[model samples]
Target: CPLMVKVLDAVRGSPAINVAVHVFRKAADDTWEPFASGKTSESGELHGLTTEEEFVEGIYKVEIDTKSYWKALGISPFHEHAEVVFTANDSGPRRYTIAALLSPYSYSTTAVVT
Candidate 1:
């Protein structure tokens, strides 16, 4: 199943609204293949990034352009951007949501299945 990418402002415990995000899948050539990309909404979420009816098990990566995000809010970004690479197992369509917890300088993310 397709997935949802949610960026949340960890300090405020709210959605990180309108943040830019890019998604890529690992290819056979060990290249990062750009596939789905978008910016977060008012809800701090990017929905339906994957095209397949079901996710293909592989290595998935995401780039959260948090520099611009923090800059928009008038804060200095210590890390600039959050570069995340994770593996998707046979967990299947179960894990359909990727939640990224963000701060001005740091980040963490996990898949939420429901």
Candidate 2:
């Protein structure tokens, strides 16, 4: 399957946030199934999901739980959560990196599979 990448960042003025990545695959019925999960490191980086034993070529979704991350900083968040959807197909050998950054107010993510 094609590689992918994701990045998440938090808004300014908020305490440091811990984010987790949940990858879900779309089934034949259009339903989603949990494929893998990983926690962001201190540098706000999460990697290796694509190399996991369960990794598969298909449509996948990523969800971030911002509510809890923000709550730990004693801040009220306009967005309680966030998500991203992407796809992967059988292809050539390449490296994939997914990253995420988050704060109390906002976050961003991207897929960088080449």
Candidate 3:
């Protein structure tokens, strides 16, 4: 099972925003499968699907709902969504942990594999 990377801000402030994340994996044939999905916690952290053994090493994509979070605060974002594409190539013998940080204006992601 691949890691469920949650994207959130570093500081938890007022005007709590809601963040949603979706993870997809690209197969060897260039097809995608819905790997994992989750929403951020009240503290801006996402946790779940950490022990689901159903991921293969290949290219992956992450999508964040930045616009929705901004809209909830009565603010309009210049972009509708933010996406991060990465590769997970592992031929090791350990588990991987992937994480990301996200804000209304920006975001980042990483891929960890074993």
Candidate 4:
């Protein structure tokens, strides 16, 4: 079960446009396997992230390149990247959503299992 993501600015409800997003699957060997990559849209949504790959129940990594994103917007970012490690508890065929609240000073992510 692959999950979807939305990137929203902390205060203004703005989209973090054109930001790079990556999905990584952690293997038993402690290696991060790159599963997918995408960019944020005008509405701050990541499109087609898990379309090309398969998602299962396990720990996954969501990496956002905040440095490039903030730089492009002419703002200094607090972090170079937003690395979120979340667990996909999709024991059956299902889907989920991850909401990422971001700002120039900080970032956070919340996952809802549906």
Candidates by TM-score, descending order: 4, 1, 2, 3
Q: For model 2, what is the error of residue 111's alpha carbon versus the real structure, in angstroms, after optimal superposition?
A: 2.6
| Cα lDDT tens digits for candidate 2, 32-82 | 988777766665555566663456567778777767666766788778677
Please give, for residues 1-114, the per-residue lDDT of candidate 3 as tens digits: 445555555334432335777777886678877777787776555566445445556676877777787787677677777777876545633455555655555556665555
- Cα displacement (angstroms), candidate 4, residue 58, comes to 2.1
lDDT for predicted candidate 2 compared with the true structure: 0.62
RMSD of model 1, in Å? 2.1
List runs of model 1 lying over 4 Å from the truth: 89-91
Once model 3 is optimally superposed onto the true structure by TM-score, how far is the C-alpha of residue 26 displaced, in angstroms?
A: 0.9
Better of 1 and 4 by TM-score: 4
Position 46, candidate 1: lDDT:
91
Report how far off residue 35 is in candidate 2 (Å): 0.8
Q: lDDT tens string, model 1, 31-86?
A: 99986889999899898776665468888888889899888888887986887777
Error of 1 at 23 (Å): 0.5
Q: Where does model 3 exceed 4 Å of error?
A: 10-17, 50-52, 93-104, 108-114
Q: Estimate each model's TM-score.
A: 0.83, 0.71, 0.68, 0.86
Listed per candidate, the RMSD to the true structure in angstroms reads 2.1, 3.6, 3.5, 2.2
